[PDB]
Design a protein around this ligand. Structure first.
Ligand code: 1BQ
Length: 254
């Protein structure tokens, strides 16, 4: 159904490293003659136990269809086993933001947050809990378009996830707060120089990540709402989407 004949794929250069092996860009020739694609490879998929786990990412991704979630294009299930995805040409978000620290305007940063919130409101409506929302798992398709990729990170995790391994859409909202902070910090990691074991203590003392330089206070406020200790007091993703739209439109008007 989405099994792709290997001769329709031209493997190109290695563009990254994955859990199971190198990621390449490539070209997919279909009945579009030259579609740019990402190809996830798997070093040890000659073993079926590894193959089953590798190909699970594809099965998971197949269930989603959203403009801000990376699309599965297809798979090749014989050795070498590949997963074919749309290429996000500008690569990982953190690296992208770091090199454009002084060249992306604030409206673009807010747009990325908004776009991610639309993907996450979609996932919440599908009753899908992500568990790992972080800038490391976001890819850049174009200067005006980011997409959620992936499918313990203590410094991103909600207190209930840390303490009791509770994961819900409300814990995803906490993580998304941290991801928004990362974006407005131009790809700096949260709690740099702080030991993982000490994170929950700071949180429990009422401390939170600080307002990023040049971040609109309305937007930092929204981040802080994501970091309510009580998950029931956090906004739902649809509310974040609504508020981010307003913040975005206000910034576009500057
Ligand atoms: C994790 N995945 C990826 C990892 C790296 C890159 C990636 C890395 C580097 C580049 C790249 O060539 N550059 C060079 C130019 C840079 C622009 C300057 O900011 C962007 C990085 C492009 C894509 C793309 C993907 C990807 N796209 N679609 C699905 C996936 S993935 O396999 O899930």
């Amino acid at each position: 159904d989405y099994e792709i004949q290997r001769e329709r794929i031209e493997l190109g250069r290695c563009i990254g490293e994955g859990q199971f092996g190198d990621v390449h860009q490539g070209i997919y020739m279909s009945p579009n003659p030259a579609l740019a694609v990402a190809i996830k490879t798997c070093k040890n998929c000659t073993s079926d136990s590894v193959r089953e786990k590798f190909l699970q990412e594809a099965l998971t991704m197949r269930q989603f269809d959203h403009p801000h979630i990376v699309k599965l294009i297809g798979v090749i299930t014989e050795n070498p086993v590949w997963i074919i995805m749309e290429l996000c040409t500008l690569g990982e978000l953190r690296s992208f933001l770091q090199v454009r620290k002084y060249s992306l305007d604030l409206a673009s940063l807010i747009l990325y947050a908004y776009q991610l919130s639309t993907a996450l409101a979609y996932l919440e409506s599908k009753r899908f809990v992500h568990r790992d929302i972080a800038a490391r798992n976001v890819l850049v398709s174009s200067n005006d378009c980011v997409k959620l990729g992936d499918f313990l990170p203590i410094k991103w995790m909600a207190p209930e996830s840390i303490n009791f391994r509770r994961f819900t859409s409300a814990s995803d909202v906490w993580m998304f707060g941290v991801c928004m902070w990362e974006i407005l910090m131009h790809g700096v990691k949260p709690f740099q120089g702080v030991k993982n074991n000490d994170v929950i203590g700071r949180i429990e003392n009422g401390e939170r990540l600080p307002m990023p330089p040049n971040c609109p206070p309305t937007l930092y406020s929204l981040m802080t709402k994501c970091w309510a200790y009580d998950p029931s007091r956090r906004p739902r993703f649809t509310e974040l989407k609504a508020q981010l739209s307003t913040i975005l439109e206000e910034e576009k008007a500057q």
